[PDB]
Write an enzyme that holds these catalytic residues in place. Structure first.
Site, mmCIF file in Angstrom:
data_model
loop_
_atom_site.group_PDB
_atom_site.id
_atom_site.type_symbol
_atom_site.label_atom_id
_atom_site.label_comp_id
_atom_site.label_asym_id
_atom_site.label_seq_id
_atom_site.Cartn_x
_atom_site.Cartn_y
_atom_site.Cartn_z
ATOM 1 N N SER A 1 0.838 -1.198 0.000
ATOM 2 C CA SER A 1 0.000 0.000 0.000
ATOM 3 C C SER A 1 0.876 1.252 0.000
ATOM 4 C CB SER A 1 -0.924 0.001 1.219
ATOM 5 O OG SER A 1 -1.673 1.198 1.298
ATOM 6 N N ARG A 2 0.758 2.072 -1.041
ATOM 7 C CA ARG A 2 1.642 3.225 -1.193
ATOM 8 C C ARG A 2 1.352 4.325 -0.177
ATOM 9 N NH1 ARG A 2 2.759 4.869 -7.290
ATOM 10 N NH2 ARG A 2 4.642 5.558 -6.170
#
Ligand SMILES: Nc1ncnc2c1ncn2[C@@H]1O[C@H](COP(=O)(O)OP(=O)(O)OP(=O)(O)O)[C@@H](O)[C@H]1O
Ligand SMILES: Nc1ncnc2c1ncn2[C@@H]1O[C@H](COP(=O)(O)OP(=O)(O)O)[C@@H](O)[C@H]1O
Ligand SMILES: [Mg+2]
Ligand SMILES: [Mg+2]
Lengths: 485, 64, 470, 60, 121
Positions: free
Chosen positions: A349-350
């Site tokens: 998850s960025r």
């Protein structure tokens, strides 16, 4: 007339080419003598190519066709909540006519560079392996990629159910309306999917845009955009809406069909060049509006089905490139027992902590570490006790930390119930406990707190953080239960 | 309580869904009825073969 | 009568172009007829090329058509016989009797083409269906009125499998059944027809409880692409009008796509990826949607799917999964070991695989069996590279069990009795679960593995282990 | 509004004979179930926009 | 009967003895026979063998009378054994041919004819 009307020159493959309509717009709807409608995607100097929303048995040669002067539009607003509509936006559940607060074009331009904010509002899915490892944020685009029968829908489905914690509340900036987009799924499946949300009281805030496989291709093409607008409504008006595209894979196939039949250039795997422009122009519609725009937000959870783990395929590569993280799922992990089988190694998850509760962030920062070293020393677990004590310690944790993430379906847990389980796991108060009793451990432990330390749980739910006082109070309550166990 | 609601509302919504279905149907046969009376207007009316050469010769022109 | 005359203008393979007159064009999906000395060559409208020209699909041999023969418009889609009149008789795609029993006296004739039931009509059930097969009833149990899928490459056991299901459900079902052979060995039909007489299901001078529709591979692309619909239509009738339970057996369903894939090129369709036609998802869709249970009647469907080159990533198989509630995947890698039916326990799933359906006890036992077989397959890299001795005490004990359960999944079918030499055995679900449960607890760690190979009930395991010792 | 005799669960754990732990378990979960339930099941249902229906009817 | 199944076990054992580990009596016994059955199946082109000549050979194989013979011997063994029956026990070959089946009596004689030949040479 010839300008507002036209004659069918040729019909077939759910696509009929008409002659006339010299004033018809691009992608505009039209109506045939029979009643079936279509939209012209190709505008040629001689004729006009028009796709069908119904059987091509109704359309004949020379038949008359007239304009509608309107682009694909769907009715939006809070009236849809608790209903089940098709790509166009008509009722199919049989609960009467819909009450919309207006309409919006199927094709809407994404919010510009300026009218946005860095995602900061967490989207609690109720999945321990998710909210702890891969946190999702209001406005983020998290992708649920995985092979068939892996648990992709389970992720989203639980997420929706986990929303009864706020939607039945009073505050609006806390709620989250859910919009599910059934594409290419048989009716039997939808009728069941709906029937599950009801037995859990979730339809009260869920919108179903059904696009069964038997329906014409274009329907399965417009479904995602139709539903897109519906949710944007909430976003524009200053609220929060979660939309799950299940699945984009089927959508592309539909679109490919139209494109090929219309004789447009075929690309990799028979997909036209504008296939990427399709999804990019869809996902970018969801975001986080700034304070000036209304602070509204639209989250997207697109679903992609790979063929034997092949994430290198065309379609997947497109989607994975656009989204902001993946929740990769593997059948293998599923068989072992690890359910949901969320490959921590790949799942990323960025946005990360930016959209995760600090109450859980304080105990999750380390949980990614242990698991990381566990995957590296996982081969050693297969060998004799000849393993040194250092590496052995890792195995003790991993086995148990992995056993905790195992969460039954339809059983979301609030953050107030996650923190206590993660905190006991990270420190290592379970290492002494058998790896067979880890399951019942969660049960008896939660019930304990809710009767003796209820004041602690409620302080974590409201504050959302863990002060030095709580960290000590939580530890003391844990060591006490582990002792008496 | 919820059951009483669902059931009543359900009875109410029925009338709307019905009403809605009637309208649609009728307006099908209604706009469709248009077809067969216009296929009768050109096929018949030999004076609707004059309004043929008419509007159509106004094609060649404009285009150029 | 007032029929519409026509005239053939082009003939290419299974594709015939007819040129009608103005205002006399038949809609899509309409049948046609052409008188021949031998029989009748029905055609099916496909497209409208324009200029009063229509492109049809030859329902039979195209050889013998003369440039410009007069075609008679049927005036509607292909009509097939319906009713209890079709029970106990063999029927082709066109709806003509092919069993030498004279004409089929049906009160109605319903078109093979029809729209899918409405979302409102859809009815969900959770009832379980007891077949008698351990590996199934324990892992992925089939649902009453549900859609079943038997996946598997060539020569895995899809036919024998579906045949046993008939030998254990069809007689035991107080309702009607419909078998539809699509693109298969004509000889398999023959044996089938012979068994239905011998079992008593079909009586020539009595009553019958099943109809037979065949459109085998010997038939042209036109036939195999519509034979599935022909038999579906007969089932659907008992569904709504008769309002009663119905068993639909389709074998094979892959020929439905393939057949269409052959002609799609000649109909001027740009070949999609892998060569299949673009209209794959829809066609595969308009067929499965019709095959379902409504509030009028229940229909249990058993469709065997073919897997080209043992590849599950193939579109045809891949697309079919979403239209199935219970999937029984067959692996060739399992056949070769001698264990049959070569069912893959991990890859095969079910809808009724829920505690709240099969029972809590049933779920736990089933889950344990799956985890055991998984770790076994996980240690396959150690049992050959380091032996069995290197494994831990917990591992060796598990491994042995995994090998016993694996061989315990095999079951002799009365249908393939000529292959195994051992008499068929039908196990009850109530005993099945009780058997593995016992083996999972280690109550039979003394019994030899060869005592679980090709064995029915758990009692037989102990009986066999004792008969060998002699 | 309900009265609900408050309950400390670790005590409840500590008063069940073993041959009765089964019961006690089911008793706990029902409670939890039941509780979750009431959190989601609202006191009263939504009202009913009578005016609207009155606005779109046909039988008097 | 289970000959095909047995040859399946052979390849199963043949691959597992690749490890270079010692084999017990069981895994080596089947390995000995399985290796010879594969050598018995080898037949020269342009040399079709009747049914009355196939049965005897397979018989001595599935049972285990070749186990006690060297591998490079199986070759001439086939030809020698046939010539043996065609000279002495020819009556049996004539029964198998006509009947096409094996009776309780035919097995007895066939059994003794095999063992008697193994003892020879
Ligand atoms: N968290 C879970 N716990 C227990 N069982 C689960 C869980 N998630 C999924 N399942 C099982 O998964 C099956 C369906 O999986 P799921 O629908 O999530 O996969 P999917 O992504 O929808 O695959 P498909 O593309 O075939 O729909 C059900 O039979 C159910 O038993
Ligand atoms: N119960 C069984 N036990 C052992 N072998 C079987 C069994 N069922 C089928 N087979 C094998 O599979 C073969 C038939 O395959 P078939 O069912 O036609 O597979 P497919 O559906 O791939 O054509 C048989 O010759 C037999 O050897
Ligand atoms: Mg799904
Ligand atoms: Mg077969």
């Amino acid at each position: 007339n010839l300008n507002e009307t036209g004659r069918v020159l040729a019909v077939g493959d759910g696509i009929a080419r008409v002659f006339g309509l010299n004033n018809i717009q691009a992608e505009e709807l039209v109506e045939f003598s029979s009643g079936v409608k279509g939209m012209a995607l190709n505008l040629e100097p001689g004729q006009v190519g028009i796709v069908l929303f119904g059987s091509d048995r109704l359309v004949k040669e020379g038949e008359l066709v007239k304009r509608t002067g309107n682009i694909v539009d769907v009715p939006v607003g809070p009236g849809l909540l608790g209903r089940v509509v098709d790509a166009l936006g008509n009722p199919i559940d049989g609960k009467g006519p819909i009450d919309a607060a207006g309409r919006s074009r199927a094709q809407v331009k994404a919010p510009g560079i300026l009218p946005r904010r860095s995602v900061h509002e967490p989207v609690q899915t109720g999945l321990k392996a998710v909210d702890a490892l891969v946190p999702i944020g209001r406005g983020q685009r998290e992708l649920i990629i995985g092979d068939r029968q892996t648990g992709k829908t389970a992720v989203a489905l639980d997420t929706i159910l986990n929303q009864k914690r706020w939607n039945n509340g009073s505050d609006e900036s806390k709620k989250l309306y859910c919009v599910y987009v059934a594409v290419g799924q048989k009716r039997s499946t939808v009728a069941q999917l709906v029937q599950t949300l009801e037995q859990h009281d979730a339809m009260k805030y869920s919108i179903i845009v059904a696009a069964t496989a038997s329906e014409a291709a274009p329907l399965q093409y417009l479904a995602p955009f139709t539903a897109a607008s519906i949710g944007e409504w909430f976003r524009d008006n200053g609220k929060h809406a979660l939309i799950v595209y299940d699945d984009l894979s089927k959508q592309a196939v539909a679109y490919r069909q139209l494109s090929l039949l219309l004789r447009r250039p075929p690309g990799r795997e028979a997909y036209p060049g504008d296939v990427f422009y399709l999804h990019s122009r869809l996902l970018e519609r969801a975001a986080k509006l700034s304070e000036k725009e209304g602070s509204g937000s639209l989250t997207a959870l697109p679903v992609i089905e790979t063929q034997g783990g092949d994430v290198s395929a065309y379609i997947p590569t497109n989607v994975i490139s656009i989204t902001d993280g993946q929740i990769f799922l593997e059948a293998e992990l599923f068989y072992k027992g690890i359910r949901p089988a969320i490959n921590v190694g790949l799942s990323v998850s960025r946005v990360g902590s930016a959209a995760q509760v600090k109450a859980l962030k304080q105990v999750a920062g380390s949980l990614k570490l242990f698991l990381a070293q566990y995957r590296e020393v996982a081969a050693f677990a297969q060998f004799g006790s000849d393993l040194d004590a250092s590496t052995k310690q890792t195995l003790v944790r991993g086995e148990r930390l992995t056993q905790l993430l195992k969460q039954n379906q339809y059983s979301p847990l609030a953050t107030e119930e996650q923190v206590p389980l993660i905190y006991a796991g990270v420190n290592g108060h379970l290492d002494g406990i058998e790896l067979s009793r880890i399951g019942e451990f969660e049960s008896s432990f939660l019930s304990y707190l809710k009767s003796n330390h209820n004041e602690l749980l409620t302080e974590i739910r409201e504050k959302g953080e863990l002060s030095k006082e709580l960290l000590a109070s939580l530890k003391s309550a844990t060591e006490s239960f582990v002792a008496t166990f | 309580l919820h059951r009483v609601y669902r059931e009543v509302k359900n009875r109410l919504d029925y009338h709307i869904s019905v009403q809605n279905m009637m309208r649609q149907k009728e307006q099908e046969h209604m706009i469709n009825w248009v077809e067969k009376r216009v296929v009768q207007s050109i096929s018949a009316q030999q004076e609707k073969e004059t309004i043929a050469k008419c509007i159509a010769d106004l094609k060649l022109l404009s285009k150029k | 009568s007032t029929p519409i005359t026509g005239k053939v203008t082009a003939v290419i393979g299974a594709i015939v172009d007819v040129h009608f007159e103005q205002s006399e064009l038949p809609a899509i999906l309409n049948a046609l007829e052409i008188k021949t000395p031998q029989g009748k060559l029905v055609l099916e409208v496909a497209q409208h090329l324009g200029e009063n020209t229509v492109r049809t699909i030859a329902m039979d041999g195209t050889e013998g058509l003369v440039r410009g023969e007069k075609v008679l418009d049927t005036g509607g889609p292909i009509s097939v016989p319906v009713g209890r009149e079709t029970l106990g008789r063999i029927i082709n795609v066109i709806g003509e009797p092919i069993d030498e029993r004279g004409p089929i006296k049906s009160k109605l004739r319903k078109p093979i083409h029809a729209d899918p039931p409405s979302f409102a009509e859809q009815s969900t059930s959770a009832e379980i269906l007891e077949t008698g097969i351990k590996v199934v009833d324990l892992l992925a149990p089939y649902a009453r009125g549900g859609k079943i899928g038997l996946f598997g490459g060539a020569g895995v056991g899809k036919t024998v499998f579906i045949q046993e299901l008939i030998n254990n459900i069809a007689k035991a079902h107080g309702g009607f059944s419909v078998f539809t052979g699509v693109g298969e060995r004509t000889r398999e039909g023959n044996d089938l027809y012979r068994e239905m007489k011998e079992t008593g299901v079909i009586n020539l001078e009595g009553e019958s409880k099943v109809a037979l529709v065949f459109g085998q591979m010997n038939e042209p692309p036109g036939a195999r692409a519509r034979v599935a619909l022909t038999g579906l239509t007969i089932a659907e009738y008992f569904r709504d009008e008769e309002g009663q339970d119905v068993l639909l057996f389709i074998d094979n369903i892959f020929r439905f796509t393939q057949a269409g894939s052959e002609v799609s090129a000649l109909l001027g369709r740009i070949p999609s990826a892998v060569g299949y036609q673009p209209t794959l998802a829809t066609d595969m869709g308009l067929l499965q949607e019709r095959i379902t249970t409504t509030k009028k009647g229940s229909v249990t469907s058993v469709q065997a799917v073919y897997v080209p080159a043992d590849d599950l990533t193939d579109p045809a198989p891949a697309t079919t999964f979403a239209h199935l509630d219970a999937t029984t995947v067959l692996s060739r890698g399992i056949s070769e070991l001698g264990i049959y039916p070569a069912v893959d326990p991990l890859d095969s799933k079910s809808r009724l695989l829920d505690a709240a359906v099969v029972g809590q006890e049933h779920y736990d036992v089933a889950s344990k069996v799956q985890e055991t077989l998984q770790t076994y397959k996980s240690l396959q890299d150690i049992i050959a590279i380091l032996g069995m001795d290197e494994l831990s005490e917990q591992d060796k004990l598990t491994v042995e069990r995994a090998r016993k359960i694996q061989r315990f999944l095999s079951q002799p079918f009365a249908v393939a009795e000529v292959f195994t030499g051992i008499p068929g055995k039908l196990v009850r679900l109530k005993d099945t679960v009780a058997s593995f449960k016992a083996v999972l607890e280690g109550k039979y760690d003394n019994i030899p593995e060869h005592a679980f190979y090709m064995v029915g009930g758990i009692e037989d395991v102990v009986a066999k282990a004792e008969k060998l010792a002699a | 509004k309900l009265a609900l005799k408050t309950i400390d669960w670790v005590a409840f754990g500590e008063i069940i004979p073993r041959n009765q732990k089964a019961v006690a378990n089911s008793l706990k979960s029902w409670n939890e179930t039941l509780t979750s339930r009431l959190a989601t099941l609202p006191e009263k249902p939504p009202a009913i926009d009578w005016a609207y229906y009155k606005a779109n009817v046909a039988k008097a």
